[PDB]
Amino acid sequence: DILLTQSPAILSVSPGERVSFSCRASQSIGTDIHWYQQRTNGSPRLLIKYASESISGIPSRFSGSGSGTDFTLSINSVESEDIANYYCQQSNRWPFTFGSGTKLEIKRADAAPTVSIFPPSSEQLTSGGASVVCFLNNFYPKDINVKWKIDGSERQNGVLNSWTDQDSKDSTYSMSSTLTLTKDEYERHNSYTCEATHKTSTSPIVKSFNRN
């Protein structure tokens, strides 16, 4: 079966630059290669068919070149919406096969996270549960740390973190930290604190609320 190699696996490009994705076949397949784009949680979308032919509805900054065993997908002036995984696929010999895929990554300017802390809701407390939610949105680079403090003292139990991949609107990152306490545990304390330590600032960005 035709083997399609996509190297490198990840491409880091600056906003506005021209990027090129590589696709090498294990044997000569003429121009029977096709390119697809897949954003986070999305389905694959045809970008280029038969190596260079354009598709209706696809931005003109996408082009393709190559023949035989060497194929290239080029994006002219990369912007935030281009952040996705890119796959190549051959139709020269049965069966059809896909490449391993290459992820596009944009290096934008540094951005401080927007921190927001949210107390448990009236509905959730009724059920006998309490989750404190903290959002660390739109920061860059992706490396960041969150710290929880209950009544001035650091807390680590019942804390779950979740990170999003690079945002396809501003090339930023975001994470969410959720402290899950029982209603009883939650009522035995007053102050709840979310602290974010990021490259953009030596001092942690702090957000707190009192249970009242």
Place this chain on the structure above:
Amino acid sequence: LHWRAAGAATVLLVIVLLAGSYLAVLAERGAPGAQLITYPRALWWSVETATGVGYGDLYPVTLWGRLVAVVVMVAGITSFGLVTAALATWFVGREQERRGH
């Protein structure tokens, strides 16, 4: 008659070209290494097969694919030879007039 069978051979050849192109893809898909797996180039293969141009860029690798190939070959050979036979009868008749027979 000769002109009719010639026209009949042409329309049949076209049908065989179309059907053969469709049947080839159906037969070749499923067999690893097969190149005759898309309709556009399968139709190009059908023309190649019927004419016997011998470019050798596309050929079936399965039993039924090869069976389809044989039908196209013979259809092409029969057609292109029926036209020859029709052209011959035409010239023979015209020769039987320029000699007054």
Place this chain on the structure above:
Amino acid sequence: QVQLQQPGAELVKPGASVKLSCKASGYTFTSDWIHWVKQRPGHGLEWIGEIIPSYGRANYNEKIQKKATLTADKSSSTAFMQLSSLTSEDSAVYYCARERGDGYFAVWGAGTTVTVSSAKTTPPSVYPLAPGSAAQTNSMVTLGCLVKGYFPEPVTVTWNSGSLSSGVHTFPAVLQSDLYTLSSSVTVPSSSWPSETVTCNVAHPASSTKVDKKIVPR
């Protein structure tokens, strides 16, 4: 219009089977082949097999264990994929695609998230996330809602029925004690809230449930 329609999710017990569907619309030719592609979370695309509805002929990937059986209904224009004897290795998103017989996949389905486990289907609990009474605000304000205690994946979170998509983050779910949990955030100008309604819509295909939760200030 959407050309390929797939169900959002299918929960399967280990050892059991499931029959995925792919209802089609748009232009229909006899040259059309319906393909099925498997994508495991964090992995790439994997061609499973193909079928031509106008004949019933089907081909499969020889390099992998045969878990699939392809069928089609010409009348309802629906393609079917029978997955049998499934394990945890079969838990993935299954796409269906249409090929005009010219080698490329022009249109794809949204994909069916197939989860293989013995756990039970559980609808999500959606709670609002309004700022505290002491929190100051800039020109913008950040709201959200909490989707917790559901199974299995996935859930779809929209803001104001999809009319509001700018400044929206939906974090990947975390798994604890056979239950998923995620949050979604939205950022609008502070002058537009709560003078204008902000509501998150949460769809959970596996339980056929869709709920709304308006975000009002505390």
